[PDB]
């Protein structure tokens, strides 16, 4: 999820852009034209607030560089299944309906008056005929990270932003479990993340192994996928892959074959499920403190793996060249008992 | 090369690059070797946890499994959250998430013999019958309403013992692990998703008593990796002045940061039973002198 968010990030500073001190404070505030293009929730907590956004779920860049947003045009008060993409200028020049507004199965507006968004910061009911455009889904303004926070319509803006930022700091555990409650944008956000392999053609698996897999295509071509095991991640954590397929199954194309870090059956899983209780207990949970049962400690429920990295080099010098050698002056045999011949 | 200060674990693999084997290397190097050390960390005190609703926290204490409160059927809880922080922060969503998680975990079966209840009119026809450890998903801005939760909480499947733990409101009767007697009032319980942040405690904890000293500034190194002491800001000097504490400030500025002979003598005195000798002239002052004397400004001392 962190990698996907970084790939989807929208920076506003750096070379060729304004600085922190010269940039005005107003630019850091929302604009009525941000709906559908840049999420208003996700944002760094630090001083770089408002200068780093994120694409919306359905946002697509036009060939010139103006962000677009899908819409279905109402011709005569009847919803149209076909959809078109509109930019800011064209969106302003038209009437955009509300997705949550009830609509009959035949496309007829049950309500004569439907709320609507207007030129700028204007919303007002209008007859159910002049309305021209309607949104696609209620989730058209949220970011990818914010789109997977259940009951987001009940929290506060600051709390929602804090949770969204926190979601990008999880640590891959040893035994992940899929959440019991979570939006439907979990598996899709994992398949597109790239950290999970997937079959290209519908074939039948001949044999599987902890280190590699071999799938037989229906055309008679054998293919093999190699899965890296316990390779240090770019930030110090571990990354692994465990195939979740059995020997002798005709796996269809597009079906996940292995689960990467923070995954459980081809869907994101950044944590576990714990039985919580809400009550002050002897002040040990005082002022945001937390109490944990030893069952978690003794069952590896929240056990993680971290891999360090060190390197040494022997570079030539004017006084000579350094060489790595088992022997070392004035050192007891016990100290170097671990070094090998080389 | 030696392991830095505060690292341990197994050695999983060693990569060595040699110029003899025709391996590209940075100019002026012959043998660069890297070693990977992997350590398994178990969650401990001083670790951050937080849900998906932005409610951070730290592990105040890890009580034994025999001390945590347990449900009427003997199922000890795994974590306890404070309540005063919910209404002030105004993040009531997590309560609904916990209720829904408990409902999904326990499994439900909404009555339909007499017909779909009015509150269950909009529920999908395939969502009226669930199984234990079921999976549910509420898309943002379109999910179960309050009435849906009210109805679902009233039809949860009973435990294998034949009794239902939680009430319609969602609260339950517990039993104190220490006193052994039930609490006077019910409490809310349920399953809530918990992540693990990257701000571990092992990285933060660090100590330094005596170690390598910088050669250019004559000051102890900095950073946990280098095994260096902590910084001492000027606000700390202001605070020390405020209390009127003088000898402490003198030590902090002279006998533990700069004075070489001072450090040696005080260390030896502590090793023995002798009293700590008074500090001397800090290296900073002597450097300032020998530098200001370079601008023809005769800086005398006037010891008299």
């Amino acid at each position: 999820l962190s990698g996907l968010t970084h790939k989807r990030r929208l920076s506003a500073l750096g070379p060729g852009g304004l600085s922190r001190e010269r940039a005005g404070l107003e630019v850091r505030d929302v604009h009525p034209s941000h709906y559908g293009r840049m999420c208003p929730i996700e944002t760094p907590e630090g001083p770089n607030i408002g200068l780093i956004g994120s694409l919306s779920v359905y946002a697509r860049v036009n060939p010139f560089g103006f962000i677009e947003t899908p819409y279905r045009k109402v011709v005569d008060g009847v919803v149209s299944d076909e959809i078109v993409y509109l930019t800011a200028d064209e969106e302003d020049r038209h009437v955009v309906a509300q997705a949550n507004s009830p609509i009959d199965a035949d496309g007829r507006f049950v309500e004569p008056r439907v709320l609507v968004r207007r030129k700028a910061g204007e919303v007002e009911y209008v007859p159910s005929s002049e309305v021209d455009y309607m949104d696609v889904s209620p989730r058209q303004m949220v970011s990818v990270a914010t789109a997977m926070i259940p009951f987001l319509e009940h929290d506060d803006a600051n709390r929602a932003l804090m949770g969204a930022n926190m979601q990008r700091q999880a640590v891959p555990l040893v035994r992940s479990e899929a959440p019991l409650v979570g939006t439907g944008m979990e598996l899709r956000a994992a398949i597109d993340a790239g950290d999970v392999v997937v079959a290209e053609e519908s074939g039948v698996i001949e044999e599987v192994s902890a280190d590699y897999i071999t799938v037989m295509h229906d055309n008679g071509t054998r293919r093999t996928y190699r899965m890296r095991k316990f390779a240090r991640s770019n930030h110090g954590t571990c990354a692994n892959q465990c195939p979740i397929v059995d020997a002798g199954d005709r796996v269809e194309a597009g079906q996940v074959i292995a689960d990467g870090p923070c995954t459980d059956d081809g869907e994101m899983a950044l944590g576990k499920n714990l039985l919580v209780a809400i009550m002050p207990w002897e002040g040990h949970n005082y002022e945001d403190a937390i109490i944990l049962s030893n069952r978690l400690v003794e069952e590896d429920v929240l056990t993680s793996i971290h891999i360090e990295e060190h390197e040494i080099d022997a570079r030539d010098t004017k006084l000579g060249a350094e060489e790595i050698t088992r022997d070392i002056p004035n050192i007891s045999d016990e100290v170097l008992a671990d070094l090998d011949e080389r | 090369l030696k392991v830095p200060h505060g690292e341990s674990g197994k050695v999983i693999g060693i990569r060595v690059f040699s110029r003899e084997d025709e391996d590209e290397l940075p100019a002026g190097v012959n043998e660069l070797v890297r070693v990977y050390v992997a350590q398994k960390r178990k969650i401990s005190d001083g670790d951050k946890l937080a849900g998906r609703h932005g409610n951070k926290g730290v592990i105040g204490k890890i009580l034994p499994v025999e001390d945590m409160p347990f449900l009427a059927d003997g199922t000890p809880v795994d974590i306890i959250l404070n309540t005063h922080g919910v209404p002030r922060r105004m993040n009531i969503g997590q309560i609904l998430e916990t209720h829904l998680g408990w409902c999904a975990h326990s499994g439900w079966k909404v009555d339909a013999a007499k017909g779909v209840p009015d509150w269950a009119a909009r529920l999908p026809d395939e969502l009226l019958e669930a199984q234990p450890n079921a999976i549910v998903s509420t898309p943002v801005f379109d999910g179960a309403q309050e009435a849906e939760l009210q109805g679902l909480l009233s039809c949860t499947l009973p435990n294998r013992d034949g009794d239902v733990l939680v009430d319609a409101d969602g609260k339950a009767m517990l039993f104190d692990g220490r006193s052994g007697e039930p609490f006077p009032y019910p409490v809310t319980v349920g399953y809530m998703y918990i992540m693990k942040l990257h701000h571990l405690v092992d990285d933060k904890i660090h100590a330094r008593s005596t170690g390598p000293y910088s050669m250019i500034t004559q000051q102890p190194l900095g950073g946990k990796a280098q095994f260096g002491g902590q910084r001492f800001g000027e606000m700390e000097c202001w605070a020390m002045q405020a209390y009127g504490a003088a000898y402490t400030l003198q030590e902090l500025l002279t006998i533990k940061s700069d004075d070489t002979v001072g450090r040696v003598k005080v260390y030896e005195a502590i090793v023995k039973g002798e009293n700590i000798p008074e500090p001397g002239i800090p290296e900073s002052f002597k450097v300032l002198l020998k530098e200001l004397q370079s601008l023809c400004l005769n800086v005398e001392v006037l010891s008299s």
Binding site: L4, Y58, S137, L187, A189, D192, E252, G266 | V136
Partner: peptide, 25 residues
């Protein structure tokens, strides 16, 4: 409506249908 072949089954509190799948992220 699971676009991917073998994703886990998790019924949802669906009330409205989105006429287009999420584009390639």
């Amino acid at each position: 409506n699971n676009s991917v072949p073998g994703a886990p089954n998790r019924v949802s509190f669906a009330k409205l249908r989105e006429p287009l799948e999420v584009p390639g992220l």
